[PDB]
Design a protein around this nucleic acid. Structure first.
Length: 60
DNA sequence: AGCAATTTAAATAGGGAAGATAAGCAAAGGGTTGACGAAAGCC
């Protein structure tokens, strides 16, 4: 399910971003979602504390 | 005690043999490098 997942994300810290300083330093935790660069094939990152979240029936 | 000459021509061709093989092993390791969240003494 998808809504189940979006809400699983929201019960947790719940951040969706396209740019971050988390890659520069893992202790940083700055997450920035730019609106202008979202396109058809724009890959999009998300953050949860310790990457928490349930999987589906196909294990994703 | 330096003086030692000039031109001219330097071979055309025919051949550079194929047949064989070119190992099989067994190794090639992991040891550290984790930030948030949550109890839990402690100024």
């Amino acid at each position: 399910m998808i809504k189940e997942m979006i809400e699983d994300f929201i019960s947790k810290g719940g951040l969706i971003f396209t740019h971050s300083g988390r890659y520069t330093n893992t202790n940083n935790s700055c997450f920035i979602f730019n609106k202008n660069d979202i396109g058809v094939d724009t890959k999009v990152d998300m953050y949860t504390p310790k990457s928490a979240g349930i999987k589906n029936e196909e294990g994703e």
